[PDB]
């Protein structure tokens with residue numbers, strides 16, 4: 046399998 | 058220097074995307090919450106490269122729009138892996154400050170203040186339990202200007218309470234490149 050993007054952290 | 062978390066998909070979606078390696082989701086932000094069907098951690102984008110820990114990602118490929126993104130960099134000795142960042146991923150820049158006032162960004166979007174106490178080490182201003190930091194490996198260590206100082210690798214703890222953080226320094230990410 047592959048590593049999946051499941052979310053994000055948005056920086057100010 | 059504030060941060061907020063956004064969920065991009067569920068577990069069922071994560072499993073199928075893990076299987077196909079094809080991810081048509083909109084990418085945004087600098088810190089990507091990355092997951093396997095089993096484990097979850099973070100990946101920081103620095104100079105068009107999506108960096109994370111080897112103990113989380115292994116030699117695994119990354120789910121992308123044109124299919125699986127093969128690892129550009131693999132350093133088992135430094136516990137660091139990198140992929141060519143997927144389109145939409147906003148990038149971070151290496152720190153030149155030389156500032157000892159560091160900030161660790163966690164998976165729950167907490168900006169916890171760290172104080173640099175070596176090349177790969179930094180003390181926690183307020184000690185947190187090991188659980189608070191679990192799954193934040195690959196997370197960034199930022200200078201007061203918001204530039205990449207390193208990537209969170211391991212916790213320096215004494216009987217369950219993390220008093221400091223061990224991180225991969227950007228100099229070694231530049232050396233790898």
Ligand SMILES: C=C[C@@H]1C[C@]1(NC(=O)[C@@H]1C[C@@H](Oc2cc(-c3ccccc3)nc3cc(OC)ccc23)CN1C(=O)[C@@H](NC(=O)NC(C)(C)C)C(C)(C)C)C(=O)O
Nearest residue numbers: 111112134135136187190191192193194210211212213223
């Ligand atoms: C509390 C959360 C912490 C951040 C966290 N990290 C992790 O859970 C990491 C994972 C593993 O650490 C490593 C594994 C591997 C590795 C390599 C190849 C194959 C398999 C494993 N390489 C490393 C290389 C290192 O320096 C060169 C340092 C640490 C490497 C152990 N650990 C730790 O944080 C542990 N801490 C440590 O081992 N800390 C020191 C001794 C390195 C300061 C733990 C006791 C808190 C669990 C996570 O979220 O995963």
Ligand SMILES: [Zn+2]
Nearest residue numbers: 152153154200
């Ligand atoms: Zn800086």
